[PDB]
Amino acid sequence: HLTMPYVMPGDGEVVGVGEPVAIRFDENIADRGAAEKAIKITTNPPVEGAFYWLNNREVRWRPEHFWKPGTAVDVAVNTYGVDLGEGMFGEDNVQTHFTIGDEVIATADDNTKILTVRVNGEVVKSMPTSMGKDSTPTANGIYIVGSRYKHIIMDSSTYGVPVNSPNGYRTDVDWATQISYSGVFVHSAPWSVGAQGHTNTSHGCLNVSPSNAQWFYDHVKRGDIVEVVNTVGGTLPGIDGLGDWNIPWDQWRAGNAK
Numbered sequence: 001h002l003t004m005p006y007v008m009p010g011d012g013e014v015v016g017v018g019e020p021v022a023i024r025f026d027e028n029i030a031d032r033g034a035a036e037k038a039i040k041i042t043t044n045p046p047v048e049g050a051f052y053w054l055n056n057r058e059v060r061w062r063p064e065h066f067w068k069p070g071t072a073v074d075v076a077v078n079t080y081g082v083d084l085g086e087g088m089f090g091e092d093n094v095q096t097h098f099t100i101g102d103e104v105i106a107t108a109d110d111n112t113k114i115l116t117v118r119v120n121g122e123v124v125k126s127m128p129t130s131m132g133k134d135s136t137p138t139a140n141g142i143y144i145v146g147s148r149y150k151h152i153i154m155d156s157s158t159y160g161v162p163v164n165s166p167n168g169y170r171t172d173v174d175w176a177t178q179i180s181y182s183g184v185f186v187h188s189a190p191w192s193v194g195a196q197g198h199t200n201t202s203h204g205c206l207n208v209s210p211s212n213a214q215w216f217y218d219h220v221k222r223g224d225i226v227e228v229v230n231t232v233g234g235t236l237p238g239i240d241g242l243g244d245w246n247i248p249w250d251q252w253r254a255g256n257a258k
């Protein structure tokens with residue numbers, strides 16, 4: 001009958017300007033209002049934010065706009081002695097302190113097929129890219145940078161698409177930076193270097209050159225932003241896991257505690 005909370009980012013991490021506070025619980029939360037009341041967030045410099053639930057075990061908190069660089073954030077999840085709904089009580093209290101780094105926003109514009117990385121507003125890299133072809137397009141919107149892998153296999157069956165089917169794949173890639181839980185990454189794609197900057201050929205990922213992918217891996221960090229614009233796709237879902245910023249502020253602020 002006890003629930004354990006887990007908070008991210010990790011204690012002492014430096015994260016980008018898009019990183020939300022995330023609190024996950026190992027059990028479904030019956031009284032979201034009680035959970036929100038138990039979570040205290042302090043920021044310096046102080047900024048307004050609000051809670052929004054991504055599913056039955058995970059709540060997020062962010063400001064209306066991306067964090068200012070240098071912001072220090074303290075999170076206190078005080079669920080000991082708190083009835084989180086239906087007599088499920090917090091197993092413990094949990095705290096985290098984190099800081100915001102430089103503002104790094106990389107914009108991939110399907111009109112030019114270039115992914116341009118800006119650091120505190122200045123262009124530092126312009127990479128030709130090949131995004132999702134028209135039958136398997138990359139969604140537009142704001143994506144938060146998640147984990148980074150020097151090598152991994154992306155397998156479409158993770159996402160309910162059989163590897164044997166027309167949009168299926170089981171693909172080894174180097175220098176892969178995850179930007180959605182729906183399976184978009186920026187990664188090395190030596191097989192699409194001809195097409196990069198000209199033609200979209202992927203199932204949704206942002207293919208770039210091996211040197212550009214390794215540069216991205218080396219220089220972009222969790223919470224940095226990639227914004228995709230002008231593709232033939234829809235918009236990344238606000239509840240993706242890394243698509244929080246696609247939910248308009250008025251809806252986020254209003255919340256869904258019920």
Ligand SMILES: N[C@@H](CCC[C@@H]([NH3+])C(=O)O)C(=O)O
Nearest residue numbers: 169182183184202203204205
């Ligand atoms: N394999 C393609 C893109 C990955 C597919 C992914 N975005 C998805 O959500 O289906 C490529 O990298 O060339």
